[PDB]
Amino acid sequence: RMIALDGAQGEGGGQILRSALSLSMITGQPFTITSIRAGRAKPGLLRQHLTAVKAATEICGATVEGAELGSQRLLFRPGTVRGGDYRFAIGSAGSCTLVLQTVLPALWFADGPSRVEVSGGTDNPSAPPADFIRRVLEPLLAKIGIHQQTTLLRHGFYPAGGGVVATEVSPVASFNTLQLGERGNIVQMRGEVLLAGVPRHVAEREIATLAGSFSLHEQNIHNLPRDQGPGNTVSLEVESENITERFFVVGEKRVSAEVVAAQLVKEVKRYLASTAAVGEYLADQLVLPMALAGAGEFTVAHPSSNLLTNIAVVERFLPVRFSLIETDGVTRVSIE
């Protein structure tokens, strides 16, 4: 009944926490995580973690133990998942899209449609960008039979807060089996820069660097209100026959525009150097919805630590088994 999870190996406050919350809500199985971030200088639950826990609590009327800052043990007993309108505030301490990742899978199982609006940080280097959710994950979720639509309403560039991201979701009626493999041909490359409170030549230089390495069929520069920054991100959308993927980098303080763009070029080339449609990050975000569908597969060039973490937690809550068969430097991930 009570699922016991160990945070000692990493992600106790992160991916394990987020996936455990939603799976717990979905299945009705309570869980306890112990040793949350025990080996970190500031150990246990951090502010952003409690926000995620409190959000899940509100959605399903949960009882919780140990939901305090610095706690290395968390116990969560879910109640019934209610649809409806939710507003969460994670502030600069966290990522809007990570709260969304935490709560949305549960809402696929609510009794009615929901809307979730989260205030806090956007454009975080360690979270799915709102546009990634919208343009990469959501078209695939739709294929799986999950219908949700995310819109960023306001930026609050990391490490600030003040951004706003909202998702509309409806309960799943029926799941489908999504099967992905080879990427197929390029249809177009789309380069993008966002700026807030940063000189416009910075975007021009970033686009120029991208163009240096790729033929860009589309190019976009968006200058946002200064108060939403300072901030700068560069993205590249790879639209292929079989999938659309997206890669982004967050501009750093003392890093030249050219270097920032160079980091993104390297990332995209690494993706293109393999045959797989699904990229490194998307892989970890497909595991949960495919496990819930009971079936599905994709290939990925490099199974990440996060992908494996997610697989393990999912298998703890659901009687599914992932196969990961690697040949020729590409791993086929299949929900048995």
Ligand X SMILES: Nc1ncnc2c1ncn2[C@@H]1O[C@H](COP(=O)(O)O)[C@@H](O)[C@H]1O
131 with 122: CB under 8 angstroms?
A: no
48 binds ligand X (CB under 6 A): no
142 phi, psi to nearest 5 deg: -55, -45
Stretch that binds ligand X, among 110-118, 167-175, 224-232, 281-289 (CB under 6 A): 281-289
Binding map of ligand X across residues 85-114, x = CB under 6 A, - = no contact: ------------------------------
132 binds ligand X (CB under 6 A): yes
Binding map of ligand X across residues 302-331, x = CB under 6 A, - = no contact: ----x-------------------------
In the block, residue with structure tokens 């016991």? 4
Chain breaks in the chain (C to N over 2.5 A) after: none
Q: What is the DSSP letter of 131?
A: H
Q: How many residues bind ligand X (CB under 6 A)?
A: 11
> Nearest distance from residue 285's CB to ligand X, in Å?
5
298 binds ligand X (CB under 6 A): no
CB closer to ligand X, 29 vs 310: 310
248 binds ligand X (CB under 6 A): yes
Residue 64 is which amino acid?
Answer: V
128 binds ligand X (CB under 6 A): yes
User: Could you tell me the sign of the dihedral formed by the alpha carbons of 223, 226, 228, 230, in that order?
Assistant: positive
Find all residues with CB under 8 Å of 39, minimum gap 6, and list them. Answer: 8
> Nearest distance from residue 124's CB to ligand X, in Å?
8
Query: Helices (DSSP H) in the chain: which residue ranges?
Result: 15-27, 47-60, 96-107, 130-132, 138-144, 200-213, 257-272, 280-293, 305-317
CB closer to ligand X, 126 vs 327: 126
Q: Which residues bind ligand X (CB under 6 A)?
A: 14-15, 126-128, 132, 248, 281, 284-285, 306
